[PDB]
Amino acid sequence: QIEQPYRTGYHFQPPSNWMNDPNGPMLYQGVYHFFYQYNPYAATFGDVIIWGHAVSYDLVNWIHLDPAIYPTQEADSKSCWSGSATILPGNIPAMLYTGSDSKSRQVQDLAWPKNLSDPFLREWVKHPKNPLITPPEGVKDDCFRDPSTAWLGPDGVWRIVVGGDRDNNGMAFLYQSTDFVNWKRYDQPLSSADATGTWECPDFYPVPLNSTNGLDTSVYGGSVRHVMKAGFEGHDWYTIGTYSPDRENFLPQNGLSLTGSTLDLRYDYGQFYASKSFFDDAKNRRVLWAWVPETDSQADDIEKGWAGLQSFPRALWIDRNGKQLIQWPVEEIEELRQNQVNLQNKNLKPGSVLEIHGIAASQADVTISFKLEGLKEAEVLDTTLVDPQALCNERGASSRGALGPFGLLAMASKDLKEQSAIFFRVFQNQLGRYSVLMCSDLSRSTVRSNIDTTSYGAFVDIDPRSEEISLRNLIDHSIIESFGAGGKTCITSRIYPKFVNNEEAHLFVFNNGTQNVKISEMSAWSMKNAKFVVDQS
Numbered sequence: 001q002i003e004q005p006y007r008t009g010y011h012f013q014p015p016s017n018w019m020n021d022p023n024g025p026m027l028y029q030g031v032y033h034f035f036y037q038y039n040p041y042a043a044t045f046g047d048v049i050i051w052g053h054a055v056s057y058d059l060v061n062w063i064h065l066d067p068a069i070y071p072t073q074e075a076d077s078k079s080c081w082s083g084s085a086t087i088l089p090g091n092i093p094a095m096l097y098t099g100s101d102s103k104s105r106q107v108q109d110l111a112w113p114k115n116l117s118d119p120f121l122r123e124w125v126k127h128p129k130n131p132l133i134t135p136p137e138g139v140k141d142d143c144f145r146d147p148s149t150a151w152l153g154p155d156g157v158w159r160i161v162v163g164g165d166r167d168n169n170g171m172a173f174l175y176q177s178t179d180f181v182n183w184k185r186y187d188q189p190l191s192s193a194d195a196t197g198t199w200e201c202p203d204f205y206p207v208p209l210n211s212t213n214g215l216d217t218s219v220y221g222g223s224v225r226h227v228m229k230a231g232f233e234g235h236d237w238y239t240i241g242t243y244s245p246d247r248e249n250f251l252p253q254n255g256l257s258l259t260g261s262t263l264d265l266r267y268d269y270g271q272f273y274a275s276k277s278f279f280d281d282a283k284n285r286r287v288l289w290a291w292v293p294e295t296d297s298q299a300d301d302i303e304k305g306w307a308g309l310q311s312f313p314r315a316l317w318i319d320r321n322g323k324q325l326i327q328w329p330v331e332e333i334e335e336l337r338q339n340q341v342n343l344q345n346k347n348l349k350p351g352s353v354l355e356i357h358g359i360a361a362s363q364a365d366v367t368i369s370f371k372l373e374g375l376k377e378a379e380v381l382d383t384t385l386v387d388p389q390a391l392c393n394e395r396g397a398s399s400r401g402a403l404g405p406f407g408l409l410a411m412a413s414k415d416l417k418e419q420s421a422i423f424f425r426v427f428q429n430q431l432g433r434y435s436v437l438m439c440s441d442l443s444r445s446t447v448r449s450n451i452d453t454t455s456y457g458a459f460v461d462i463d464p465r466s467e468e469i470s471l472r473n474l475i476d477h478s479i480i481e482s483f484g485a486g487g488k489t490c491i492t493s494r495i496y497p498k499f500v501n502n503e504e505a506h507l508f509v510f511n512n513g514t515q516n517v518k519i520s521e522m523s524a525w526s527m528k529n530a531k532f533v534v535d536q537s
């Protein structure tokens with residue numbers, strides 16, 4: 001028998017209880033800081049939410065600390081909601097966050113470490129003039145929140161954004177200040193969309209063109225572009241554009257307002273929400289934290305007594321062609337790798353299933369690369385308007401085609417009665433150009449009742465003719481982060497097979513199509529647990 005079969009081994013998550021929106025991430029004095037929305041009283045959202053706190057020297061192995069920001073003054077008596085962190089000149093970190101005041105309205109609060117001597121910033125103090133910012137003119141007291149990391153303009157003035165809506169038209173309210181205490185709403189929003197509802201946890205940063213690293217938020221230039229990100233309709237979206245401080249104007253690259261349609265871009269197309277990035281000036285990389293909600297019954301959450309996991313921190317950067325963003329787990333994860341199992345030049349005959357042996361199947365890192373031959377045989381399906389989620393949900397692992405479904409069977413039982421399939425499908429349009437679809441077929445992930453087993457999918461932007469379809473998977477018990485094409489298309493999935501209570505998990509590579517495919521290379525590593533020390537009291 002096995003207890004707590006769903007807690008992860010190397011993904012960040014508190015000892016117990018509920019967690020969501022990751023908060024004010026930052027790198028201060030050689031230490032990585034992470035904060036998270038926490039309900040110290042149950043395994044479900046509640047009327048009282050504080051800021052969880054934990055530190056790490058490598059984003060992998062953590063140390064849980066006492067909660068940092070909790071309601072102490074009127075400006076946040078009901079709860080301390082999401083916010084961001086900004087290290088101001090002088091090496092002093094500032095925390096701006098949304099609070100729920102006595103009158104139950106959402107406002108912006110400021111706070112900062114109280115004992116900078118302390119490597120772990122255990123104790124924090126609020127400013128006295130809190131709240132620093134209150135809902136604008138025509139804005140409802142529960143539609144104004146999630147302030148961003150601030151950025152300093154060449155003119156010496158700061159800039160931040162706050163989420164919310166104006167008559168149900170999601171917006172990025174922009175405020176400016178010189179001291180970081182007195183703020184004034186700017187005349188227009190930084191950006192916005194219609195009928196999208198409250199924009200949550202906005203994020204606005206610069207990405208260096210033709211590079212693969214990050215920049216300090218405050219950077220700007222002609223060889224730089226800006227990502228305007230926002231959550232809404234249960235998903236986090238973004239858009240690459242150009243920023244011009246002089247008029248606080250954001251001009252999208254594709255020239256579209258966010259729509260939440262299969263027309264826009266998301267970081268991850270599965271369970272991924274309330275994401276926030278931050279600049280790591282030690283390794284020159286922009287890191288991305290994101291909340292991964294549960295998919296099992298609320299009843300189930302109260303039983304296991306915990307909800308919420310954080311994605312494994314991924315590095316962010318704009319693509320070579322500059323039209324989309326790329327993500328990849330930070331190198332530190334590599335140090336968790338134990339033993340390995342390879343495969344090279346292995347054909348997967350039509351309708352076959354090859355098992356990977358010797359790996360720690362339930363907690364591993366698996367990369368696999370397919371070599372396609374005979375594309376002319378691709379099914380015929382113009383994909384200009386097709387919605388991939390519908391397609392993976394209609395054509396699962398058991399729907400045989402020409403090229404694909406071919407891929408990986410993770411968190412699977414020995415009898416394949418329960419399985420989670422991450423795979424591909426290659427299609428071709430009348431004119432002869434190809435398209436690749438990536439899927440996460442959770443339809444058979446678990447036999448348990450009351451579990452959301454919806455599947456997730458997205459189209460991968462590569463050329464099957466020239467490049468091989470690559471796929472890495474971070475398998476950690478109840479979460480699977482599927483990285484396709486080197487991070488050009490990511491998909492996080494939560495699954496809860498029943499077998500994980502008695503039997504051990506299995507790992508397979510498979511091809512259920514009619515056309516033969518070959519495994520160019522398959523590198524699989526068993527992943528050891530991440531160290532989680534506790535220093536609270």
Ligand SMILES: *[C@H]1O[C@H](CO)[C@@H](O[C@@H]2O[C@H](CO)[C@@H](O[C@H]3O[C@H](CO)[C@@H](O)[C@H](O)[C@@H]3O)[C@H](O)[C@H]2NC(C)=O)[C@H](O)[C@H]1NC(C)=O
Binds near residue numbers: 398
């Ligand atoms: C991909 O290849 C097959 C594509 O159909 C798929 O077959 C599985 O087995 C049969 C078809 O041979 C079907 O199962 C039927 O019987 C079960 C009884 O256990 C019913 O519950 C099903 O609803 C259905 O009537 C399924 O179509 C299919 N899946 C299973 C095992 O139920 C293979 O499974 C696919 N390869 C893998 C392992 O992903």
Ligand SMILES: *[C@@H]1O[C@H](CO)[C@@H](O[C@@H]2O[C@H](CO)[C@@H](O)[C@H](O)[C@H]2NC(C)=O)[C@H](O)[C@H]1NC(C)=O
Binds near residue numbers: 115117118119
């Ligand atoms: C401010 O932070 C420092 C650094 O952690 C604290 O100093 C440590 O205090 C413990 C006992 O509380 C000692 O065992 C360590 O030797 C101290 N280290 C240093 C660097 O002095 C200090 O106590 C904190 N002050 C407050 C306000 O609690």
Ligand SMILES: OC[C@H]1N[C@H](CO)[C@@H](O)[C@@H]1O
Binds near residue numbers: 037082
């Ligand atoms: O826990 C409160 C936070 N949940 C939302 C995102 O899920 C944020 O807008 C809000 O600040």
